[PDB]
Amino acid sequence: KAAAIGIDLGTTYSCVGVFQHGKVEIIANDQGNRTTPSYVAFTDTERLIGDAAKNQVALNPQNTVFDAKRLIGRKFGDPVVQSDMKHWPFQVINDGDKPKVQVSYKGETKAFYPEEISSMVLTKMKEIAEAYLGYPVTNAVITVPAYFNDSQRQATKDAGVIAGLNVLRIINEPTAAAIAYGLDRTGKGERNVLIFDLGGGTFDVSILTIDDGIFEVKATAGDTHLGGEDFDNRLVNHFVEEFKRKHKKDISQNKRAVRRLRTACERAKRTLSSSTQASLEIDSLFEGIDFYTSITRARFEELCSDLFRSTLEPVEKALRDAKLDKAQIHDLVLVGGSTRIPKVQKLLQDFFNGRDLNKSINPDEAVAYGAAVQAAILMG
Ligand SMILES: Nc1ncnc2c1ncn2[C@@H]1O[C@H](COP(=O)(O)OP(=O)(O)O)[C@@H](O)[C@H]1O
Ligand SMILES: [Mg+2]
Ligand code: NA
Ligand code: NA
């Protein structure tokens, strides 16, 4: 009985799980990581996926693809595509009203549909699963945002088929998170569930009604350009200003210095979820000058205060659209890596008058956890 896997094909990070023996195994990749960047890179010599793409020793911005999930299933002329293109370092081209990402690989220009890019991330997730299981995987559940339309769903499925998978079902992210917590097991009688999902790039609030195992999506809200990367960017700008103060040099036009600082800021952020301060130490940041400093949790919170507070507006809106009072939410579920931030948890819990948060499943894994549960259900 060869297991089906569950894949969270994320905007910024993806995750794969498998259900066996009554229990989900979230599968670590070859570097030991339980999540894997949704990044593909092309060089003079190789195609890199995941951690190797995100962590290249040498900047390759034109040929390092990410955010494919923002393109998948959309027409080239979609306002969202045209908007997003302006900020990406890689080129997007029109092929018969469909976007393609164009890069250089082994010295030749070529282009890929978003579903081909995303198939490369799914193949990596498949391979991570296969390395753990010891045999080929042929069946999967793949998740998508609740707001995805038929074309975005179909393109995600087609990314799965490309990758060699039989896609058992495409299921919504917030539904997968609820399944992870066993909330689908409820009997007859409506239960309202709020899923608060703050990831790397996007913020999604969904309100679900579950009644005897049947899910209805009652409301969706959020901000497609609010996520952990924006918090990293506030720390970057802070530290650029601190380096000018101390060294009388502006690092901001040095692409490598900014990248290294951003990576260091992301790591210090994560530390600040469990400690009240973090050390940020980068050798030879700019013109040979070491930058050894630190950041407190309080200061981080100040830097990002408007961003964190803004997460409550979509929560209000979703409650209004679902025609529900706070007290009528039965369960609050945290999804997305950025939900580990203490101040974000505080804001939400305070808004809900002290209500417990369902947070025992690592929030960046919950989607995959549920998709793995559901893939085994569907296999029978
Ligand atoms: N311990 C942590 N504290 C703060 N943020 C974190 C923590 N762990 C992960 N994150 C952040 O979570 C984001 C990724 O969220 P994730 O849910 O894995 O992906 P995606 O949004 O693709 O679904 C990144 O911005 C990352 O820095
Ligand atoms: Mg996510
Ligand atoms: Na993810
Ligand atoms: Na999200």
Author numbering: 3 to 382
The authors write:
TEW is the best described member of the POM class of additives that are used to allow phasing and to promote protein crystallization. Binding of TEW did not induce conformational changes of HSP70 in either crystal form.
In crystal form 1, the asymmetric unit contains a single molecule each of TEW and HSP70 NBD. The crystal packing is identical to that of the crystals that were obtained in the absence of TEW. As observed in the absence of TEW, ADP is bound deeply in the ATP binding pocket. Terminal oxygen atoms of TEW form hydrogen bond interactions with the side chain nitrogen of Asn355 (2.7 Å) and the backbone nitrogen of Ala329 (2.7 Å). TEW lies at a crystal contact and interacts with the neighboring HSP70 molecule: a bridging O of TEW forms a water mediated interaction with the side chain of Ser276 (2.6 Å) and a terminal O of TEW forms a hydrogen bond with the amino group of the bound ADP (3.1 Å). Additional electron density around TEW suggests some disorder of this molecule in the structure.
